[PDB]
Scaffold this motif. Structure first.
Motif, short mmCIF file in Angstrom:
data_model
loop_
_atom_site.label_atom_id
_atom_site.label_comp_id
_atom_site.label_asym_id
_atom_site.label_seq_id
_atom_site.Cartn_x
_atom_site.Cartn_y
_atom_site.Cartn_z
N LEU A 148 0.91 0.49 18.22
CA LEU A 148 2.36 0.65 18.41
C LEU A 148 2.76 1.09 19.85
CD1 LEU A 148 4.69 2.27 15.69
CD2 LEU A 148 3.84 -0.09 15.77
N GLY A 201 -12.08 3.59 9.05
CA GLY A 201 -12.11 3.85 7.64
C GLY A 201 -13.49 3.85 7.07
N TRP A 211 -7.34 -6.05 7.40
CA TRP A 211 -6.98 -4.79 6.75
C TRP A 211 -6.77 -3.75 7.83
CZ3 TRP A 211 -5.07 -2.35 2.83
CH2 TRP A 211 -5.32 -1.00 2.63
N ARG A 212 -5.66 -3.01 7.66
CA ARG A 212 -5.10 -2.13 8.66
C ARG A 212 -5.07 -2.88 9.98
NH1 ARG A 212 -7.87 3.61 8.98
NH2 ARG A 212 -6.85 3.47 11.03
N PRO A 213 -4.08 -3.77 10.14
CA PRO A 213 -4.01 -4.68 11.27
C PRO A 213 -3.29 -4.09 12.46
CG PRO A 213 -2.38 -5.28 9.59
CD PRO A 213 -2.88 -3.88 9.30
N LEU A 214 -2.84 -2.85 12.37
CA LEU A 214 -2.26 -2.21 13.52
C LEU A 214 -3.10 -1.00 13.94
CD1 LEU A 214 1.48 -2.54 12.29
CD2 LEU A 214 0.31 -3.90 14.04
N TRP A 249 0.88 -1.12 0.00
CA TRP A 249 0.00 0.00 0.00
C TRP A 249 0.93 1.19 0.00
CZ3 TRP A 249 -2.67 -3.83 -0.83
CH2 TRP A 249 -2.79 -4.92 0.04
N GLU A 250 0.60 2.20 -0.80
CA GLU A 250 1.28 3.49 -0.74
C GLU A 250 2.66 3.46 -1.41
OE1 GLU A 250 0.92 5.15 3.36
OE2 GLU A 250 -0.42 3.45 3.71
N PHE A 294 -16.87 7.23 -3.45
CA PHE A 294 -15.54 7.39 -4.03
C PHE A 294 -15.54 8.08 -5.40
CE2 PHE A 294 -12.79 5.77 -0.94
CZ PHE A 294 -13.31 4.64 -0.34
N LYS A 345 -3.63 1.53 12.20
CA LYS A 345 -2.82 2.66 11.72
C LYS A 345 -1.67 3.07 12.64
CE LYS A 345 -5.13 5.64 8.89
NZ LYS A 345 -6.35 6.51 8.91
N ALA A 397 4.57 -4.37 17.87
CA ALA A 397 3.96 -4.85 16.63
C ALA A 397 3.85 -6.40 16.59
CB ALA A 397 4.73 -4.33 15.41
N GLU A 446 11.39 -8.02 10.81
CA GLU A 446 10.79 -8.02 12.12
C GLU A 446 9.38 -8.56 12.02
OE1 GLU A 446 10.72 -4.20 13.88
OE2 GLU A 446 9.42 -4.79 15.56
N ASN A 447 8.57 -7.93 11.18
CA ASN A 447 7.18 -8.35 11.03
C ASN A 447 7.12 -9.82 10.70
OD1 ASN A 447 6.34 -5.73 11.51
ND2 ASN A 447 6.25 -5.19 9.31
N1 LIG Z 1 -11.14 3.45 3.40
C1 LIG Z 1 -10.42 2.70 4.22
O1 LIG Z 1 -10.67 1.52 4.42
C2 LIG Z 1 -9.25 3.35 4.88
C3 LIG Z 1 -8.02 3.10 4.35
N2 LIG Z 1 -6.93 3.64 4.86
C4 LIG Z 1 -5.67 3.29 4.18
O2 LIG Z 1 -4.80 2.40 4.91
C5 LIG Z 1 -3.45 2.77 4.59
C6 LIG Z 1 -2.77 3.24 5.86
O3 LIG Z 1 -1.56 2.53 6.09
P1 LIG Z 1 -1.03 2.29 7.60
O4 LIG Z 1 -2.11 2.73 8.54
O5 LIG Z 1 0.29 3.03 7.69
O6 LIG Z 1 -0.96 0.66 7.70
P2 LIG Z 1 -1.11 -0.29 9.02
O7 LIG Z 1 -2.46 -0.37 9.70
O8 LIG Z 1 -0.41 -1.52 8.48
O9 LIG Z 1 -0.31 0.60 10.09
C7 LIG Z 1 0.95 0.20 10.61
C8 LIG Z 1 2.10 1.12 10.22
O10 LIG Z 1 3.14 0.80 11.14
C9 LIG Z 1 4.39 0.72 10.48
N3 LIG Z 1 5.12 -0.53 10.79
C10 LIG Z 1 5.21 -1.67 10.06
N4 LIG Z 1 6.01 -2.57 10.66
C11 LIG Z 1 6.46 -2.00 11.80
C12 LIG Z 1 7.34 -2.40 12.92
N5 LIG Z 1 7.91 -3.62 12.93
N6 LIG Z 1 7.54 -1.52 13.93
C13 LIG Z 1 6.97 -0.30 13.93
N7 LIG Z 1 6.16 0.13 12.94
C14 LIG Z 1 5.87 -0.66 11.88
C15 LIG Z 1 4.16 0.79 8.99
O11 LIG Z 1 4.82 1.92 8.48
P3 LIG Z 1 6.39 1.88 8.14
O12 LIG Z 1 6.49 1.68 6.63
O13 LIG Z 1 6.81 3.27 8.58
O14 LIG Z 1 6.96 0.76 8.99
C16 LIG Z 1 2.67 0.89 8.82
O15 LIG Z 1 2.42 1.96 7.91
C17 LIG Z 1 -3.51 3.89 3.55
O16 LIG Z 1 -3.44 3.34 2.23
C18 LIG Z 1 -4.86 4.54 3.84
O17 LIG Z 1 -5.46 5.30 2.79
C19 LIG Z 1 -6.96 4.48 5.91
C20 LIG Z 1 -8.16 4.81 6.51
C21 LIG Z 1 -9.41 4.25 6.06
#
Ligand SMILES: NC(=O)C1=CN([C@@H]2O[C@H](COP(=O)(O)OP(=O)(O)OC[C@H]3O[C@@H](n4cnc5c(N)ncnc54)[C@H](OP(=O)(O)O)[C@@H]3O)[C@@H](O)[C@H]2O)C=CC1
Length: 271
Positions: A192, A263, A183-186, A22-23, A271, A188, A209, A235-236
């Protein structure tokens, strides 16, 4: 310790861990993939939306060994428009017959999404995709499509993470042999730094994590966490060196909120 895999009603099998894309931007996509594979990452998952299927299909040149998931975006729905959508994803991704194919959202107001599932059941009856499934569907929405066309999707991907555990939907899911992808298992990254997780990661000599990534594992959840910083990647992915107790499991279960969604509500999302 070697990883695990989850299997599907249609007899295919998918690693329970994989890499989210993603992204992460198209030209670094290419790069980040290989880098990742080298870590022992086994599944990859992107979506049409992000437009980095090209970067994936180059990234995965001469790595067919790996489970590849992708998602049909909302402006491609219907019957004939989906088949088209698939070929092209398959083209940019470059593996004519893909592993998993997901309908990104229902969009039920758009009413065009059951048409979209037939296009899918087709692609698998052809054997031009291996395994078909959906993303962001509800009870209402799945029922609707299982009655319409007699085949259950193998996986429905949904928002979920300690603060939201869709146990309703995981009840429905389980009762139809459906696999449930997180989906979005942390949440966001809210978690952490959550303090219940500051004890349970201490306890097991890990970071917050992994603790949670594992939660997903010990729930039968296909989970697809996204990072770029390869320190995090491995790590993950290093989440098999341990295990957790019910003191733990029913202590991260208290983190669930009714209001924990973050979300689009897929019933209402536009959309
Ligand atoms: N409509 C919907 O369903 C919605 C969708 N979204 C979408 O979800 C996405 C958001 O991504 P995000 O929330 O960042 O994803 P996650 O829920 O996977 O959030 C976890 C974040 O933690 C970081 N991470 C990963 N591994 C580790 C680790 N070992 N230790 C510490 N940090 C870690 C990652 O960034 P890093 O790369 O820095 O490690 C990751 O971005 C976007 O595409 C957004 O648009 C958001 C809101 C609503």
């Amino acid at each position: 310790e070697a990883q695990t895999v989850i299997s599907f009603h249609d007899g295919h099998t998918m690693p329970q861990i994989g890499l989210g894309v993603w992204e992460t931007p198209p030209d670094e996509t290419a790069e980040v993939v290989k880098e990742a594979v080298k870590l022992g990452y086994r599944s990859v998952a992107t979506a049409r939306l992000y437009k980095n299927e090209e970067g994936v299909g180059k990234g995965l040149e001469d790595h067919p060994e790996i489970f590849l998931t992708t998602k049909l975006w909302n402006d491609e729905q219907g019957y004939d428009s989906t088949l088209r959508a698939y070929e092209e994803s398959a083209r940019l991704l470059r593996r004519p017959v893909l592993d998993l194919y997901l309908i990104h959202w229902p969009m039920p107001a758009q009413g065009q999404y059951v048409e979209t599932w037939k296009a899918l059941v087709e692609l698998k009856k052809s054997g031009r995709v291996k395994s078909i499934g959906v993303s962001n569907f509800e009870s209402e929405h799945l029922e609707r499509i299982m009655d319409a066309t007699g085949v259950v999707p193998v996986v429905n991907q949904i928002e979920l993470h300690p603060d939201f555990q869709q146990r309703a939907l995981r009840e429905f899911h389980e009762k139809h042999n459906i696999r449930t992808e997180s989906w979005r298992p942390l949440g966001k990254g809210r978690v952490l730094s959550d303090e219940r997780i500051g004890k349970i990661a201490e306890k097991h000599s890990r970071t917050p994590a992994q603790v949670v990534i594992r939660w997903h594992l010990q729930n039968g959840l296909i989970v697809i966490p996204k990072s770029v910083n390869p320190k995090r990647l491995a790590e993950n992915l290093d989440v098999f060196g341990f295990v957790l107790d019910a003191d733990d499991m029913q202590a991260i279960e208290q983190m669930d909120r009714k209001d924990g969604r973050m979300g689009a509500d897929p019933n209402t999302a536009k959309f």
